[PDB]
């Protein structure tokens, strides 16, 4: 019955911080959680569990898995990181920004490849940002000004549940006092998703033809739109002209995109034609692209490694004094394919589940270490499983929202007696490696 305000929900890009927890009398049981979506409710319900991992656990010859002390696990990982020739550390989607700084230091000492879930998720988007730029905005800007909203290839209803009710559509802002009723929502994707149910338009496009769709829109905008064919990408020219007229007349627009663009043919060229469209619309209106980042602090590795090495993802830290970045050559999946690794470290992700199974097969040839709070597929095919605190429930810190706005997450439960957090763990690994004098 000790109600705690302003907590952070640590799952989706929304980084919602309007969460209220009613912690038990002893400060270690969560009773009721208000204002959060279900996916979040379950995160907190799992964090407040009574039967949770407390010590590392090693793979014995028999194939079972027995516990070891933290110092022994740190010794194991340090010795292996030094003995290896090009270790790969992957993850960082779900960690505080101190967890993504400590890891950068550890792999600076080691000399391996450091990488995050950007490669497999919105890294194709960054590659377009490198090409064309990122005309964007914070989310309060679309809350307080947006007149048109476009969800191109995204599905907020199931990806980011309270995105619509917090930032985009339903809130009544300052210059949008009328709320939804003066917002025009356009949703583009081949399915008739729940976002399309809520929407007012829908451009059911053939899966994979978004490049042709964007080119049609941009010819319309550039002015001689009469040269369009009868239909484009399955969309009909009159509907194209309708949506384009709405976009032109928008007082302040905003485009959101997701897997519909970053996981189909022409991974980054879809995103950069979208960005070109936004830059073209800002000739006569105000339009701001914006990427639907997935995990809470998945924009955290981007900024932290931007300030540390200058490169958001796919870091080639093997020269030990100059880093390199080329996603086609230094990314986790391509290196796993070309068996270019020597050790895989699972930190803040589920590589076993969410990688292609050929890549997982290629990777498991080498040692495999997992730093997770709870059991998952990586912790089931790893060699040792080091527990760690959960961001936002057992430990606080900074996280980075969809739009690179830092939210400060709070602590609601003390972690089980013995369990440390990743910044302490990565720092101890780095200290032990320097002790081993490499």
């Amino acid at each position: 019955p000790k109600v705690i305000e302003n907590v952070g929900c640590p799952y989706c890009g929304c980084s919602c911080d309007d969460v209220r927890i009613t912690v038990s009398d002893d400060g270690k049981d969560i009773l009721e959680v208000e204002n959060v979506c279900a996916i979040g409710t379950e995160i907190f319900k799992h964090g407040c569990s009574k039967d949770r991992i407390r010590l590392p656990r090693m793979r014995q010859p028999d194939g079972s898995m027995k516990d070891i002390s933290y110092e022994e696990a740190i010794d194991w990982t340090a010795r292996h990181l030094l003995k290896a020739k090009k270790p790969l550390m992957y993850g960082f989607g779900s960690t505080n920004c101190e967890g993504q700084a400590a890891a950068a230091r550890v792999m600076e000492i080691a000399g391996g490849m450091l990488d995050n879930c950007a490669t497999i998720c919105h890294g194709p988007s960054f590659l377009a940002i490198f090409d064309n730029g990122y005309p964007s905005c914070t989310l309060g800007e679309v809350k307080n000004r947006a007149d048109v909203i476009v969800y191109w290839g995204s599905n907020p209803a199931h990806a980011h549940p309270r995105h619509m009710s917090r930032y985009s559509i339903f809130p009544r802002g300052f210059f949008t006092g009328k709320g939804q009723k003066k917002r025009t929502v356009i949703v583009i994707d081949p399915r008739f998703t729940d976002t399309a149910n809520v929407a007012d338009y829908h451009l059911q496009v053939k899966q994979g033809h978004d490049y042709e769709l964007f080119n049609a829109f941009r010819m319309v905008i550039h002015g001689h739109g009469k040269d369009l064919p009868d239909e484009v990408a399955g969309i009909k020219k009159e509907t194209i002209l309708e949506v384009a007229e709405i976009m032109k007349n928008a007082r302040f627009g905003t485009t959101f995109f997701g897997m519909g663009l970053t996981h189909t043919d022409g991974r980054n060229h879809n995103i950069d034609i979208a960005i070109s469209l936004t830059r073209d619309l800002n000739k006569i209106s105000k339009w701001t692209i914006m990427a639907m980042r997935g995990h809470y602090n998945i924009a955290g590795p981007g900024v932290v490694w931007s300030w540390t090495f200058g490169f958001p993802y796919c870091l080639d830290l093997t020269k030990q004094n100059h880093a390199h970045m080329n996603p086609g050559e230094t990314s986790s999946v391509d290196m796993a394919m070309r068996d270019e690794v020597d050790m895989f470290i699972n930190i803040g992700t589920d590589a076993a589940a969410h990688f292609p199974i050929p890549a997982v097969k290629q990777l498991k040839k080498h040692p495999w270490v997992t730093i997770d709070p709870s059991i998952n597929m990586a912790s089931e095919i790893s060699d040792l499983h080091i527990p760690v605190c959960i961001c936002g429930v057992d430990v606080g810190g900074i996280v980075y929202r969809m739009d690179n706005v830092p939210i400060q997450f709070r602590k609601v439960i003390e972690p089980p007696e013995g369990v440390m957090d990743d910044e302490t763990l990565l720092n101890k690994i780095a200290d032990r490696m320097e002790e081993l004098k490499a």
Partner: protein
């Protein structure tokens, strides 16, 4: 028959993973095909029956249902997870983003065959399936 395919999200799927990747909720949420009613009739797939989704980079036995989110004739959909990534092709096009949406696949109605659990799928792909 060529039957283009995508792999995407669902709230029940997110809920399931945060219950736990090894839970009955996760099994129920992810082992799912959400295809079109016209395609189900034309192929010969009984609603709520196992089916063999076999692409060039694998194979998986997955329950076949119909989804509210109306897939147009010629589209498939698995909620992302163990089962979908058993069949996702690894081609990246030198970008690091595998072909997670938009790969061809053939669908074969194969009832009377069980579904493979998440642990069984992954630990057997690696060669660790003790149980």
């Amino acid at each position: 028959k060529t039957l283009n395919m995508i792999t995407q999200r669902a709230v029940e799927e997110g809920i399931a993973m945060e219950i736990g990747k090894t839970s009955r909720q996760y099994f129920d949420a992810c082992s799912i095909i959400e295809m079109n009613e016209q395609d189900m009739k034309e192929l010969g797939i009984m609603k709520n029956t196992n089916v063999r989704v076999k692409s060039e980079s694998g194979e998986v036995v997955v329950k076949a249902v119909v989804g509210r989110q109306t897939c147009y004739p010629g589209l498939c959909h698995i909620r992302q997870g163990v089962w979908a990534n058993q069949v996702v092709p690894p081609r990246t096009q030198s970008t690091g983003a595998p072909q997670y949406s938009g790969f061809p696949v053939t669908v074969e109605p194969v009832p009377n065959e069980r579904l493979k659990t998440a642990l069984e799928l992954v630990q057997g792909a690696v060669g660790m399936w003790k149980g």
